[PDB]
Curated annotation (Swiss-Prot), chains A, B:
<feature type="site" description="Involved in DNA binding">
    <location>
        <position position="26"/>
    </location>
</feature>
<feature type="site" description="Involved in DNA binding">
    <location>
        <position position="34"/>
    </location>
</feature>
<feature type="site" description="Involved in DNA binding">
    <location>
        <position position="46"/>
    </location>
</feature>
<feature type="site" description="Involved in DNA binding">
    <location>
        <position position="21"/>
    </location>
</feature>
<dbReference type="GO" id="GO:0006260">
    <property type="term" value="P:DNA replication"/>
</dbReference>
<dbReference type="GO" id="GO:0003697">
    <property type="term" value="F:single-stranded DNA binding"/>
</dbReference>
<keyword id="KW-0235">DNA replication</keyword>
<dbReference type="InterPro" id="IPR003512">
    <property type="entry name" value="Phage_M13_G5P_DNA-bd"/>
</dbReference>
<feature type="site" description="Involved in DNA binding">
    <location>
        <position position="16"/>
    </location>
</feature>
<comment type="similarity">
    <text>Belongs to the inovirus G5P protein family.</text>
</comment>
<keyword id="KW-0238">DNA-binding</keyword>
<comment type="subunit">
    <text>Homodimer.</text>
</comment>
<dbReference type="Pfam" id="PF02303">
    <property type="entry name" value="Phage_DNA_bind"/>
</dbReference>
<feature type="site" description="Involved in DNA binding, and in the dimer-dimer interactions of the protein-ssDNA complex">
    <location>
        <position position="41"/>
    </location>
</feature>
<protein>
    <recommendedName>
        <fullName>DNA-Binding protein G5P</fullName>
    </recommendedName>
</protein>
<dbReference type="GO" id="GO:0039684">
    <property type="term" value="P:rolling circle single-stranded viral DNA replication"/>
</dbReference>
<dbReference type="InterPro" id="IPR012340">
    <property type="entry name" value="NA-bd_OB-fold"/>
</dbReference>
Length: 86, 86
């Protein structure tokens, strides 16, 4: 139901890095995508992938249920967008 | 795709009230519901409805696209859960 599109230009990902307070480094992969929210065009969205998750190939995806969780105030929140092919 | 269930016990809603800093009062309706996230059972979630939105009747619902928006850091966030009957 939520249609997410990774265009050919968006196979191109980036990696952000640093070290934590507690002496330990990190790297997160980041990729852009288009999410169709029923507006005139799809919106540009940024995804930050989980540790050691490969970037997504071009194609149509949908949002996997594991993207969601119950937040701090009892309401449903997005943890991070986890996609599965359509 | 996200299945939300309002049980007969959850027709029972509540209203929270107060006045704002800038001299103006408010009231938000709040209702509970069950969201199926593929785990062993559905999770209990709290919904806070929009201004002047009536509470939901019992039944099966799904999440409407207008629940989502692009947040402050460029990622997709839930604004508040807006439901439509299944």
């Amino acid at each position: 139901m939520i249609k997410v599109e990774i265009k050919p230009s968006q196979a191109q990902f980036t990696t952000r890095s640093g070290v934590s307070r507690q002496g330990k480094p990190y790297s997160l992969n980041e990729q852009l995508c288009y999410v169709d929210l029923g507006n005139e065009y799809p919106v540009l969205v940024k995804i930050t992938l989980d540790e050691g998750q490969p970037a997504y190939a071009p194609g149509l995806y949908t949002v996997h249920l594991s993207s969601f969780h119950v937040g701090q105030f009892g309401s449903l929140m997005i943890d991070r967008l986890r996609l599965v092919p359509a």
